[PDB]
Symmetry: C2
Subunit: 190 residues, 2 copies
Amino acid sequence: AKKVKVITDPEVIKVMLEDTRRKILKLLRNKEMTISQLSEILGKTPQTIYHHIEKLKEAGLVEVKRTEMKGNLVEKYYGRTADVFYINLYLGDEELRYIARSRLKTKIDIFKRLGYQFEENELLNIMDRMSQKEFDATVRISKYIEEKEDALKDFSNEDIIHAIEWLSTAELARDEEYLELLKRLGSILK
Amino acid sequence: AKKVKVITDPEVIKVMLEDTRRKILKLLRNKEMTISQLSEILGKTPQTIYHHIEKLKEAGLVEVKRTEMKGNLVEKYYGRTADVFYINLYLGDEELRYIARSRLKTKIDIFKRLGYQFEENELLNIMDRMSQKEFDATVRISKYIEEKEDALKDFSNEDIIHAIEWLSTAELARDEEYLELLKRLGSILK
């Protein structure tokens, strides 16, 4: 509904991954803002934010909540289509899988940079499987949350988010493959 | 240093837990802002933000980065003392333990509200132990990160944050008590 929204459309997911777009979405949680306000906060130019917002709008991630004649300029106030978004990078989309792997590899550079030694090929595989299991479990429970929103109107989105993590964690805990993957990680990363 | 800062002082931790203070800190990551700017974004009154900032300033969490004569009002620009803060609710401080338990109980109400049935006393204990282990592992690795900041200047704080999670997870994975706690959760929450 409006509190939580699960996204499985590879095209919108791809659009919301962009760095600035992310920051915009994070920002819009505070309240609906205009292209100017976002600009001032993000240290980004108005024209650039305009394009990002346009993209997010076209992706159904944001919408115009109201317009206002701010002096000599009529501006639109944008607000998120949902309080919290949940995505699954493991929806079978080839490009999404490689983005996930691109992200997991960045952290591996960090490990080696920090002095951790290991066989990067094995680690990436173990991280990718664990991450796939985690995304699938989180989508699974966030969907059930999404349909039970009326029963949670009395809770902050932060508490709801953290609750999903626990419920999701309890899920992974019933997955022996996951447990095995978790133990290998403990052996590989030291 | 400036990228990461681990906080073990119960008094500052207590100060940064306040809801609005949290939002302020989250906001200040984008850039240094004045009491007015925060106010407009947070939908909170200027005097109230003033008190929050004062508290955060007194807690060493924020500092004045520069002042500016904005028309008829001289304002201060506040910025975080560190890009990312890490806390440990399990530093032996009695009141902190109960705050942690207050938070874990909120999520249990959410579970029951969502239809999950279980013995709340056991769950709270299992969540608290798992959470204690997790906080201790994260503080442990974030400290090592804190001293190796020079080697990470080329990475975003987001990647660094996610890296700590993985390194921290690999840690918990070597803890058999944790593994057992993790499996009980899988049995308790369904």
